[PDB]
Every structure is written in C-alpha cells, then in structure tokens.
Amino acid sequence: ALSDADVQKQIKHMMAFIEQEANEKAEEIDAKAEEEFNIEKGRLVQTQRLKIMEYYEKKEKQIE
Template sequence: MTAFIKQEATEKAREIEIKADEEFAIEKSKLVRQETDAIDAAYRKKFKQATMSQQITQSTVANKTRLRVLGARQALLDDIFAAAEKRLGEATQDKARYAAVLKGLLLEGFYALSESDVRVRARKADYEIVREAIGAAAAEYKEKTGSEVAATIDEEDDLPDGR
C-alpha cells in the first residue's frame, strides 16, 4: 500500500512539475514577447529621432549654403550697382552720346505713355541738352506715329544733381 501511495504521489508530483513547466514556458514566452516589443518600440523611437536629427542637420546646412549664396549674390549686385553709378557720372561727359541716349529715352517714354502732353524732370545742369533731345524725340515720334506730343521740362520739380 505504501508503494501505491508513493507511486500516486510520484505521478502527482510529475503532473504538477509538467504543469508548472508549461506555465513557466508560457509566462517566459509572454515576457520575451513583451520585452521584444518594448525593444522594437525603443528602436523605432530612436530611429525616428535619428532621422529627424539628420533632416534638421541637412536643412540647416542647406539654409546656411543658401544664405552664403544670397550673400555672395548681394555683394556682386552691390558691386555692379556701384560700378553702374560710377559709369553713370561718366555718361554725361560725352555730350553727343549723352544727347543720343536722352533722345532715345524720351522717345521710349513717349511710346510707352502715348500721351499728347508730357512733363519731363531733369537736372538743372541738363536743361539745355534735354530741350534739344525733347525736340528731336518729338519730331521722330511724330514721324513714326503721326501724332504730336508736347513735352516740357518741369522746372519746378527738378532732379537733384548727382543723379
């Protein structure tokens, strides 16, 4: 009888051990899955942060480059404007060429405005040459379009010297 009880106890112990091993395996796989998911989530978060950081860095570098290009372009434009301003002062030295340029500009203005009465602003120093250019431009305008234009110098509101 003791052998039977011992046998029953051994079988019961084996069943309990098997059941405990199964529960342990289930709990272990559940914990492994949870930790794997947590590690995957942490990896995704770090990857997203690294990607965002890389995009920010690229954007910063691109903006700095763009600003350098814009700065260089502005410096070049400033140089061009300074050179043009210097050459504009020299343009009035050759009177014949200056008169031709004024006539062309006046004629272009007459065409653009298409008005019969035009007031022209000029520097006091250029009044005489502008009068001659107005006459020549008005004559050519009449010849080309067939309509007359009356242009006068606005002596009340003249341009400042140096421009």
C-alpha cells in the first residue's frame, strides 16, 4: 500500500546485507587458507627434517 521508494530502499538494504556477507566469506576462506598453508607446511617440514636428522645421525654413529 506504499510507494515504490520504500520497497526500493528496503530491497537495496537487503541486497547490501547479502553482498557484505558475500565479501566477508571469501575473505575468511582465504585468510584460513593462509593459516593452513603455514601450519601444514611446518608440520611437513619438521616431520621430514627430523626423520633425515635421525637417519643421518645413525649413519654418523656407524661412521665413527
């Protein structure tokens, strides 16, 4: 029973709310991606660096 201005305003606001969430979610996903990159990276790095460390240490004992 109201003017087209009021629906245009309200729908513009609804669209803005969605676009806002739309942006925030992508940003959130990439930030987590950066975190997981470093976390997973370190786990892999420590795992094999330690493995070869022990491998070669034993070889060093054999050498001595």
